[PDB]
């Protein structure tokens, strides 16, 4: 029985991974993870049900591959081994990340390897990162670093954030993922080039499944799948901008505790994820109860006087009352959408009418229909929204011009902060 036959006959792809939202994570709206979503599509490619396990550190993640009847593979942001170990093989690389030395902003800035001398440095035991340090320890015998079997990447970055350690080494993708929680963490320099992540399979000369893993990854590159997962999980800095990423991290820690309770009480009955609600909060005013603009909206959820009036808001500037009116208002809109629009697409169309309004959203829906697209599918109608700002297109709508691009930004961002709060 080949490695490939066995999975096909067992009806199940056994995959091992780390506990982390980079890799695999369990929440209310189901499971998520770069690696999970990817290995999930691989089990789908083969006709099989995926089953996820977790190791407690990386020596034990690699161990399980040697166990009898253990995991088919490890999908875990692993980057291949620089030396020779017969007990493990690696797929083609599926993502270019750069190891980077991480420091606390405003502290002494290391700029070359020498500078890592005489610093408290922590790293994961069994990591490629650990191994890049040993190699430099040959060059620099005075180098000290701690190898830890207990902590994960998120813990290493926390430590640098608040100064229990000076430095760590981590791949740039997970740094960017984590930049929205640790406002003081910064990239000291690049300690190498964009070596790639690969999945690990037990050692051997059987390739039945390895060729398929490699065929799947080459297909995934062909269709943009890795690029899309990269943006969802690892593109916070890329998408939100550096300044947006760390300030968000500041606001998570300094502003959200003041309102979280209210976000949660509104969620409870409205059966609406409070974290979705807070995300609207964050996009609307960066969790600033007292915020006003020059365009007719005040408060935490940026309400008009007429909405505040209809939702029974006494004081648009009171955090609780703004959240309540603004949360009630999202659900009123969600509820007014045609019956034909289904979750989860429903919630995303509701985010968009929340920014642009029902009339205009209807026109982009109608526009999707005329173009042969599905007006009940969000990815379909999101392609039309921008067009509401285009001459040839708005002049054909009942309600004309609208800032559809702003509206697409509004939903992408809220969906990203939603992810972020889910990933805390
Ligand atoms: C820090 C580790 C969890 C990840 C690293 N790419 C490795 O393969 O060792
Ligand atoms: Cl979107």
UniProtKB/Swiss-Prot annotation:
E.C. numbers: 4.2.2.n1
Record's subcellular location: Cell outer membrane
InterPro entries, alphabetized: Lysozyme-like_dom_sf, MltF, Solute-binding_3/MltF_N, Transglyc_AS, Transglycosylase_SLT_dom_1
GO cellular component: cell outer membrane
Catalytic residue positions: 284
Superkingdom, taxonomy of origin: Bacteria
Enzyme type, top EC level: lyase
GO terms for MF: peptidoglycan lytic transglycosylase activity
GO biological process terms on file: cell wall macromolecule catabolic process; cell wall organization; peptidoglycan catabolic process
PROSITE patterns linked to this entry: TRANSGLYCOSYLASE
Annotated Pfam families: SBP_bac_3, SLT
Gene3D superfamilies linked: 1.10.530.10, Periplasmic binding protein-like II
SMART domains from the UniProt entry: PBPb (SM00062)
Keywords, in A-Z order: Cell outer membrane, Cell wall biogenesis/degradation, Lyase, Membrane, Signal
Membrane topology type: Peripheral membrane protein
Domain remarks: The N-terminal domain does not have lytic activity and probably modulates enzymatic activity. The C-terminal domain is the catalytic active domain.
Its biological purpose: Murein-degrading enzyme that degrades murein glycan strands and insoluble, high-molecular weight murein sacculi, with the concomitant formation of a 1,6-anhydromuramoyl product. Lytic transglycosylases (LTs) play an integral role in the metabolism of the peptidoglycan (PG) sacculus. Their lytic action creates space within the PG sacculus to allow for its expansion as well as for the insertion of various structures such as secretion systems and flagella.
PANTHER family attached to this UniProt entry: MEMBRANE-BOUND LYTIC MUREIN TRANSGLYCOSYLASE F
Family, similarity comment: In the N-terminal section; belongs to the bacterial solute-binding protein 3 family.
Annotated protein name in UniProt: Membrane-bound lytic murein transglycosylase F
Name of the coding gene: mltF
